[PDB]
Amino acid sequence: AKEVIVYTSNTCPHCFTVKEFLSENNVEFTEKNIQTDAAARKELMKKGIMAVPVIQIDEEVVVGFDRDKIEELLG
């Protein structure tokens, strides 16, 4: 099972889709809210990303909800 991180915020209109897709497929994930967690925002910007929502499959970064890419990375 690959580590799944979801970078979210308090003003993210597309986070619900990603969270729902992951939860309905019973794929647990770590949520990091970059608006309330300065550490999370630092980690996200260190990898050169400033967007929301973001999905990290254990090293690989998906900006936005790329359904088939996520499905392929997770199996």
Asked if 2 and 46 count as a contact pair (C-beta separation under 8 A), the reply is no
Per-residue exposure over 4-43, b if at least 16 CB sit within 10 Å of its own CB, e if not: bbbbbbeebeebeebbeebeeeeeebeebbbeebeebbeb
CA distance 63 to 53: 7
Reported resolution in A? Answer: 2.8
> What determination technique applies here?
X-ray
All structural domains of the chain? 5-74 (3.40.30.10)
Amino acid at 10: N
